[PDB]
């Protein structure tokens, strides 16, 4: 994995030694070169994971998250270069440094062979995210949002530290490859109950779990566009990655510990989606949609059937692409009206037709239109949870109604109807913005041709 970590670190001299007008073009070019290089991780086998060293390996779960992560950096650089154009050159280089450093932490978070190194990188991802939100966020509430984002994650994860060090003392190792073969069944006790909670609640917060999700409609909304892209597209999916790693060590206790949390998700996706029907802030509507979509990933990991893991990792990759594009579309209208009120700018298909078509495609992938990998993940999770209990389809199916309802209302409020009269600074769509939308949507639609690469280690 050292053929990826070293170019990501060489992106630091590539942004701090660049000419003052070349610091976006060079970082975009070489980050796209790293993203083209990321395809070598697709050397996956049906039996063995691509095991590099004592420190790094990459199975078919971590590989699509890595390719999405290394792809997301050029898209964040294209997204965040317009509103940081009047910024000081040193703070501009510091912003690019925080994005590069966050990618650097993420690519060795997903390839951590050992779990306490996973913890160190997993909590290392807080600090560039916290600095990006609380420094380049636009409104007043970025400080409070950074506080909530920091202290939900740390309060969930400092018991995870004690739990992982307890596994290191008990089993002898926190290598995942060793613990595939030295896993002991976890019996029923209160000690093993709080063992389970300490191993799970950090990732429950990072997914987020319903009831614990209060950081997210502040952290995703008060962030800048690159912060919202990396928080929605990757940093939620650390929780699903970590749960899929750590429920190896939590059997058969998960079979009766998952019962409340599944309820919290199966009801939570009914609530948060319903919250999306009454959100006046468009960016908050996309945030609660992200909560509603990650509730299915929580359910699928907690029922721990193969169809559920295949659908959950397909839903993670698909929601990363779709939610990143929806935040970028909301930014494309925020850079024209300078407000996030959804009812303010209306009728935008009369003025911006191709950008309305990008809104249309992002809304159709949001509502899981087949054969998108959104629908492949959604459908496979629904199959596995019908196998879990035959009544859950009601909570699934009603969700698939409400998920349609706000996905098109967002399309009807913003793009359709009569245009707002007094708003006259609606510029034509830049080539940069349509490039951003196309680089989100075209990989998402190409993955419908060959979806087996985003279906996880048990395809």
């Amino acid at each position: 994995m050292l053929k990826y970590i070293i170019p990501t670190m060489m992106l630091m001299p590539l942004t701090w030694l660049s000419k003052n007008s070349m610091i976006w073009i060079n970082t975009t070019l070489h980050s796209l070169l790293i993203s083209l290089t990321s395809l070598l991780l697709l050397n996956q086998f049906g039996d063995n994971s691509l095991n590099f060293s004592l420190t790094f390996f990459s199975d078919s779960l971590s590989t699509p998250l890595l390719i999405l992560t290394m792809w997301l950096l050029p898209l964040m650089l294209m997204a965040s270069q317009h509103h940081l154009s009047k910024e000081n050159l040193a703070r501009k280089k510091l912003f690019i440094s925080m994005l590069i450093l966050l990618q650097l932490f993420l690519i060795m978070t997903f390839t951590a062979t050992e779990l306490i190194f996973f913890y160190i990188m997993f909590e290392a991802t807080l600090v560039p995210t916290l600095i990006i939100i609380t420094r380049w966020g636009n409104q007043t509430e970025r400080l409070n949002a950074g506080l909530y984002f920091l202290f939900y994650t740390l309060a969930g994860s400092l018991p995870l530290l004690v739990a992982l060090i307890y596994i290191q003392n008990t089993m002898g190792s926190l290598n995942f490859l060793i613990l595939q073969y030295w896993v002991q069944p976890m019996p029923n006790s209160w000690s093993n109950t709080f063992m389970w909670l300490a191993c799970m609640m950090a990732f429950m917060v990072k997914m987020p779990l319903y009831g614990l999700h209060l950081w997210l409609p502040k952290a995703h909304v008060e962030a800048p566009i690159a912060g919202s892209m990396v928080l929605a597209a990757i940093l939620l999916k650390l929780g699903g990655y970590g749960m899929m790693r750590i429920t190896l060590l939590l059997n058969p206790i998960t079979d009766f510990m998952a019962y409340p949390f599944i309820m919290l998700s199966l009801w939570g996706m009914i609530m948060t989606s319903s919250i999306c029907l009454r959100q006046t802030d468009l960016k908050s509507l996309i945030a609660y949609s992200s909560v509603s979509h990650m509730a299915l990933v929580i359910v699928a990991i907690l029922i721990q059937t193969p169809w559920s893991y295949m659908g959950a990792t397909a839903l993670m990759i698909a929601h990363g692409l779709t939610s990143s594009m929806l935040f970028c579309l909301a930014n494309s209208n925020y850079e024209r009206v300078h407000s996030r009120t959804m009812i303010l700018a209306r009728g935008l298909q009369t003025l911006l037709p191709l950008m309305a078509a990008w809104w249309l495609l992002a809304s159709l992938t949001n509502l899981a239109l087949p054969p998108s990998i959104n629908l492949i993940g959604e459908l496979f999770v629904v199959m596995s949870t019908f196998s879990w209990s035959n009544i859950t389809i009601i909570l699934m199916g009603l969700n698939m109604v409400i998920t349609a309802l706000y996905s098109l209302y967002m399309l009807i409020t913003t793009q359709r109807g009569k245009h707002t009269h007094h708003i006259n600074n609606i510029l034509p769509s830049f080539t940069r913005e349509n490039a951003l939308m196309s680089l989100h949507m075209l990989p998402l639609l190409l993955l419908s041709l060959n979806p087996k690469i985003i279906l996880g280690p048990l395809y």
Binding site: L2, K3, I6, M10, L14, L17, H30, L33, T37, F52
Partner: protein, 50 residues
């Protein structure tokens, strides 16, 4: 060089690729010793992989 900055990240790949190969020889204890892939060495060949 007039464009010396466009070789920081590619050479950082190449060097990094080199280190990966450099680590493979440090994990070569079971080379031609696995119960699945052990075999007699072909003529003019000293290692099965590098």
């Amino acid at each position: 060089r007039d464009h010396w900055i466009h070789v920081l990240v590619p050479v950082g790949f190449v060097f990094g690729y080199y280190l990966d190969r450099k680590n493979d020889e440090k994990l070569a204890a079971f080379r031609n010793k696995s119960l699945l892939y052990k075999r007699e060495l072909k003529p003019q060949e000293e290692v099965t992989w590098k």
